[PDB]
Amino acid sequence: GSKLPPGWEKRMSRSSGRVYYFNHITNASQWERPSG
Numbered sequence: 001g002s003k004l005p006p007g008w009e010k011r012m013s014r015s016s017g018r019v020y021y022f023n024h025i026t027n028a029s030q031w032e033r034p035s036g
Contacts, residue, residue: 001035008034 004021011022011029022029 002032004030004032004034006034006036 005023007023007025008021009024010019012018013020013029018031020029020031021034
């Protein structure tokens with residue numbers, strides 16, 4: 001994929017903000033897309 005590892009969700013920010021992805025191991029979030 002695009003720099004992100006597997007381990008992720010497509011959470012939403014404050015509400016409408018963005019679908020910042022969120023990892024569930026490390027619980028960081030981001031704009032790219034993982035695929036392995």
